[PDB]
Design a protein around this motif. Sequence first.
Motif, mmCIF file in Angstrom:
data_model
loop_
_atom_site.group_PDB
_atom_site.id
_atom_site.type_symbol
_atom_site.label_atom_id
_atom_site.label_comp_id
_atom_site.label_asym_id
_atom_site.label_seq_id
_atom_site.Cartn_x
_atom_site.Cartn_y
_atom_site.Cartn_z
ATOM 1 N N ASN A 160 1.189 18.263 -4.994
ATOM 2 C CA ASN A 160 1.865 17.158 -5.657
ATOM 3 C C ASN A 160 2.083 17.498 -7.102
ATOM 4 N N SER A 161 1.435 18.547 -7.518
ATOM 5 C CA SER A 161 1.531 19.029 -8.845
ATOM 6 C C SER A 161 2.348 20.317 -8.833
ATOM 7 N N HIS A 221 0.817 -1.193 0.000
ATOM 8 C CA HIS A 221 0.000 0.000 0.000
ATOM 9 C C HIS A 221 0.853 1.245 0.000
ATOM 10 N N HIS A 222 2.160 1.051 -0.067
ATOM 11 C CA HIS A 222 3.072 2.171 -0.235
ATOM 12 C C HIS A 222 3.036 2.630 -1.687
ATOM 13 N N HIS A 223 2.598 1.706 -2.564
ATOM 14 C CA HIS A 223 2.428 1.941 -4.005
ATOM 15 C C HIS A 223 3.756 2.230 -4.711
ATOM 16 N N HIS A 224 3.735 2.203 -6.017
ATOM 17 C CA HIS A 224 4.906 2.579 -6.782
ATOM 18 C C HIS A 224 4.811 4.026 -7.190
ATOM 19 N N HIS A 225 3.664 4.615 -6.900
ATOM 20 C CA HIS A 225 3.486 6.039 -7.031
ATOM 21 C C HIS A 225 4.079 6.675 -5.809
ATOM 22 N N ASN A 226 5.293 7.098 -5.921
ATOM 23 C CA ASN A 226 5.967 7.711 -4.817
ATOM 24 C C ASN A 226 6.239 9.145 -5.157
ATOM 25 N N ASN A 227 5.239 9.942 -4.952
ATOM 26 C CA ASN A 227 5.292 11.344 -5.241
ATOM 27 C C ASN A 227 5.279 12.099 -3.938
#
Length: 109
Positions: A25-26, A4-10
């Motif tokens: 984040n943008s 749940h850490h995801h590969h979306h690490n923004n």
Amino acid sequence: MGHHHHHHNNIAYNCCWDQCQACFNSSPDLADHIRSIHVDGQRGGVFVCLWKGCKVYNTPSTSQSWLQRHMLTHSGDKPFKCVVGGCNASFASQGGLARHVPTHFSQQN
Ligand SMILES: [Zn+2]
Ligand SMILES: [Zn+2]
Ligand SMILES: [Zn+2]
């Protein structure tokens, strides 16, 4: 597997600006809030960068075009919008805006 850490690490781009803990984040959203609450926030004739990361921050300057050009480095906007609350002008290049802004900064003298 429970990833749940995801590969979306923004990362949330929090501005290090005096008491503004705001994080977008943008990049445009970040720049938006800079221009709105930072740049437009210092509308007292002297604009100051409180961005901790600058080596010249906490130094009020009357150079609205410079301030904006300095924050350009911080968040990266594209259109430069008029700083005047109630004025609408946006230019992708600052040269056009740098001609518009001093017309308002003809206040009194
Ligand atoms: Zn902020
Ligand atoms: Zn700065
Ligand atoms: Zn304007």
